Enzyme design. Structure first.
Site, mmCIF file in Angstrom:
data_model
loop_
_atom_site.group_PDB
_atom_site.id
_atom_site.type_symbol
_atom_site.label_atom_id
_atom_site.label_comp_id
_atom_site.label_asym_id
_atom_site.label_seq_id
_atom_site.Cartn_x
_atom_site.Cartn_y
_atom_site.Cartn_z
ATOM 1 N N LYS A 86 0.807 -1.224 0.000
ATOM 2 C CA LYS A 86 0.000 0.000 0.000
ATOM 3 C C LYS A 86 0.822 1.246 0.000
ATOM 4 C CE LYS A 86 -4.020 -2.020 0.020
ATOM 5 N NZ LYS A 86 -4.773 -1.843 -1.259
ATOM 6 N N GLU A 98 -10.071 6.009 1.984
ATOM 7 C CA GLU A 98 -10.951 5.009 2.537
ATOM 8 C C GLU A 98 -10.039 3.910 3.031
ATOM 9 O OE1 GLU A 98 -9.975 4.955 -0.720
ATOM 10 O OE2 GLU A 98 -9.230 2.883 -0.774
ATOM 11 N N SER A 147 2.219 -9.642 -0.318
ATOM 12 C CA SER A 147 1.726 -8.253 -0.276
ATOM 13 C C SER A 147 2.018 -7.551 1.067
ATOM 14 C CB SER A 147 0.232 -8.210 -0.601
ATOM 15 O OG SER A 147 -0.575 -8.940 0.346
HETATM 16 C C1 LIG Z 1 -1.791 -6.398 3.163
HETATM 17 C C2 LIG Z 1 -2.835 -6.389 2.092
HETATM 18 N N1 LIG Z 1 -2.773 -7.259 1.061
HETATM 19 C C3 LIG Z 1 -3.728 -7.270 0.085
HETATM 20 C C4 LIG Z 1 -4.839 -6.414 0.070
HETATM 21 C C5 LIG Z 1 -5.894 -6.447 -1.038
HETATM 22 O O1 LIG Z 1 -5.919 -5.231 -1.856
HETATM 23 P P1 LIG Z 1 -5.242 -5.115 -3.336
HETATM 24 O O2 LIG Z 1 -6.014 -6.247 -3.989
HETATM 25 O O3 LIG Z 1 -5.486 -3.663 -3.776
HETATM 26 O O4 LIG Z 1 -3.766 -5.308 -3.331
HETATM 27 C C6 LIG Z 1 -4.959 -5.435 1.169
HETATM 28 C C7 LIG Z 1 -6.135 -4.540 1.126
HETATM 29 N N2 LIG Z 1 -6.363 -3.713 2.257
HETATM 30 C C8 LIG Z 1 -7.255 -2.566 2.069
HETATM 31 C C9 LIG Z 1 -8.708 -2.977 1.911
HETATM 32 O O5 LIG Z 1 -9.251 -3.404 3.184
HETATM 33 C C10 LIG Z 1 -7.141 -1.586 3.207
HETATM 34 O O6 LIG Z 1 -7.954 -0.622 3.203
HETATM 35 O O7 LIG Z 1 -6.221 -1.774 4.087
HETATM 36 C C11 LIG Z 1 -3.938 -5.429 2.223
HETATM 37 O O8 LIG Z 1 -3.989 -4.553 3.278
#
Ligand SMILES: Cc1ncc(COP(=O)(O)O)c(CN[C@@H](CO)C(=O)O)c1O
Ligand SMILES: Cc1ncc(COP(=O)(O)O)c(CN[C@@H](CO)C(=O)O)c1O
Ligand code: NA
Ligand code: NA
Lengths: 385, 388
Positions: free
Chosen positions: A82, A104, A371
């Site tokens: 992220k 969000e 991730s």
């Molecule tokens: C560690 C990790 N891996 C994967 C995902 C999935 O999102 P992506 O499909 O955009 O990578 C998230 C999503 N997390 C988002 C949605 O809840 C958030 O607002 O924190 C995440 O935190």
């Protein structure tokens, strides 16, 4: 604008001005020497890129099929991918003269990342979060506040991720003169699906370089989990034109597809228009958007990015599901076997890679996008295991 | 073995053989090309080294004095510098043919690091931890379990770190043929304080190249927190022969030195002998080791490594204290100003650097070693600072 039929920009007139300014600024800055010097400088010295590509030897041997490499986004500052997109967009916002960011979040990880990047560049940060999610993410909520962000609990609707996006959009309509809405995945109206994917692409460009160094060739398969789809597009996109490379996105099977308690938009959702885009969404018989379920709090968005819907439709990538139980088994296995505690989202990709490696040849290569790290998920795993 | 008059090998005769073998093996492998290729390999691909050196421009400008750089050991796999030594010693163990690792831990960070490295390398792992520390560190105990390690609560004595080290030593006596005791700081009988420093030295070698590259010159000051002393030794050591560079170790002042609730062995302890070494310890009139206090869980060892006692003695390094209150403010301040949540241990170094910076010219350069990230410390901070 469009990926095949999917994507686009289907929004009230009050969204048109903010979106065109954003597109204009993005077109201007995305290749600006100064903007990129600063973006790479923060990604390097603050986020800690590049992240390594790790050969999971013990895991590979035990399963006894294909070599399993892990792209280690769990090591990024913040503990998840992220951060790449938060830095990208916050800097963009700063270059456009914004002083505030909103975003969000569901699991809290994108909220934390946004707070971090906001603190880094000295902008106000307000995070919209559904009150059902605020209640389940106590420690991410606290992190956000330590970082100086305010958390606005959203009490409207189903009090969950879709509802937080709705309020974020309303705010942005009023405040875009000084506010940038920092969307967290490859979803929403143009140009967000493109911007976010552009800012996550760094993952795949590193991974491609690193696997050529490690193995002298491209991978036979890349596997990433899919919520909205940013980490997957991040690692997929630089391999899209490499015909050898299979791309597999793993969605949340929850309690099983038949149960109707899951988050598998591409496998069991319908095509529809929501949040300014045409893509796959999970919806009821009334047509309204349906609540999702997964043990992974980050796989909670009741839709998926259009560029995935596109890659699915042209069969360039394949989409599968992994259940709660299987993800949890993978969280444990990776911990014990390689000493890496993965995020529960990422554990879905690990579990699928484990099943696939078994069927493949020892000469073949799987890259799994890790991730995030699992520190944030310890309470959940404690309660269940 | 000796750093001036500090160090040595004060152990029962039973431990002489194990320490002898270890010393032989470390001399053999320290320079073995294969050992180092593998070590560098794991440090890079699994631990994520090199970590960056980050210029905290907002912090610097808010304070309006010296430039503050942060060596980002918080980004290492596991979230602390401990991992560097854990990999080093676990690899060494495996090259020595050992199949089991034991370790002590107070905060839990070295326990976690040890469990991670044992999982990586396919070794069994048992961690000794004082029952009172177990109770305060449920999440790290849980992490260790998830990593396949066995956590053994120590109910003898004060049920704290000193007691865990005592239990670990007894274990090693009986089990050294196949077990390696992975000590987590620059403490213990020779050869441990040398080895751990050697394995943490990568921090300073990186930081040194990174600062020449960012500023074309060496720093005016390096600040690190000092528990047992490993993160500080790691970053200090490659600069020891650079006359120019001040070294400042920061100890836990706790509720304040006059309160006697602190963990400042160099500032208010005595010369003593425990855990196989002659160094400074917090010990009372009847020669018993004292309880320590700090808000930072990892500044709990009631002593300090002999190489720090040496640097203090010859005045190569200065040693200061920072209170709980100052450490907490710095923890909040770094998070809010730079979007980096530091470990409470490392926040002691940050707090001191902020003070020093104020008294220095904008031309000058301070490197702070950020030994760990603050994720593990969120419950503590929630409790003490309160919710927002
Ligand atoms: C560690 C990790 N891996 C994967 C995902 C999935 O999102 P992506 O499909 O955009 O990578 C998230 C999503 N997390 C988002 C949605 O809840 C958030 O607002 O924190 C995440 O935190
Ligand atoms: C993040 C962090 N920073 C600093 C220190 C201090 O130890 P050092 O002086 O050996 O670096 C510790 C020690 N922690 C030790 C002692 O409790 C442990 O067993 O985990 C730490 O965990
Ligand atoms: Na979905
Ligand atoms: Na001490």
């Amino acid at each position: 604008m469009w990926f095949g039929e999917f994507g686009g920009q289907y929004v009230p007139e009050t969204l048109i001005e903010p979106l065109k300014e954003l597109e204009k600024a993005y077109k201007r800055f995305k290749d600006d020497e100064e903007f990129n010097r600063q973006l790479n400088y923060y990604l390097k010295t603050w986020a800690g890129r590049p992240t390594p590509l790790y050969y999971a030897k013990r895991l590979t041997e035990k399963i006894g099929g294909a070599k399993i490499y892990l792209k280690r986004e769990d090591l990024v500052h913040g503990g998840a991918h992220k951060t790449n997109n938060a830095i990208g967009q916050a800097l963009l916002a700063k270059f456009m003269g914004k002083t505030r960011l909103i975003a969000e979040t569901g699991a809290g990880q994108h909220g934390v990342a946004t707070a971090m990047a906001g603190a880094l560049l000295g902008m106000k940060v307000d995070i919209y979060m559904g009150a059902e999610d605020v209640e389940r993410q106590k420690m991410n909520v606290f992190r956000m506040k330590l970082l100086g962000a305010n958390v606005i609990p959203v009490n409207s609707g189903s009090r969950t991720l879709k509802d937080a996006i709705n309020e974020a959009l309303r705010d942005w309509v009023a405040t875009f003169e000084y506010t940038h809405y920092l969307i967290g995945s490859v979803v929403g109206p143009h140009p967000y699906p493109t911007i976010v994917r552009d800012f996550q692409s760094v993952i795949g460009r590193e991974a491609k370089a690193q696997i050529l160094e490690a193995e002298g060739q491209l991978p036979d398969v890349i596997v990433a989990c899919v919520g909205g789809g940013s980490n997957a597009m991040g690692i997929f996109y630089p391999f899209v034109n490499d015909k050898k490379v299979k791309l597999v996105g793993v969605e949340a099977g929850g309690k099983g597809l038949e149960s109707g308690k899951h988050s598998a938009s591409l496998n069991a959702g319908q095509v529809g228009v929501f949040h300014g885009m045409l893509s796959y969404f999970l919806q009821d018989e009334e047509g309204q958007i349906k609540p999702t379920h997964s043990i992974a709090p980050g796989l909670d968005y009741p839709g998926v990015g259009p560029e995935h819907a596109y890659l699915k439709k042209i069969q360039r990538a394949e989409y599968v599901t992994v259940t709660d139980e299987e993800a949890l088994k993978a969280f444990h296995e990776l911990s014990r076997t390689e000493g890496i505690i993965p995020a529960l989202e990422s554990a879905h990709a690990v579990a699928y890679a484990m099943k696939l490696a078994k069927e493949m040849s020892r000469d073949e290569i799987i890259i799994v996008n890790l991730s995030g790290r699992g520190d944030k998920d310890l309470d959940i795993v404690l309660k269940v295991s």
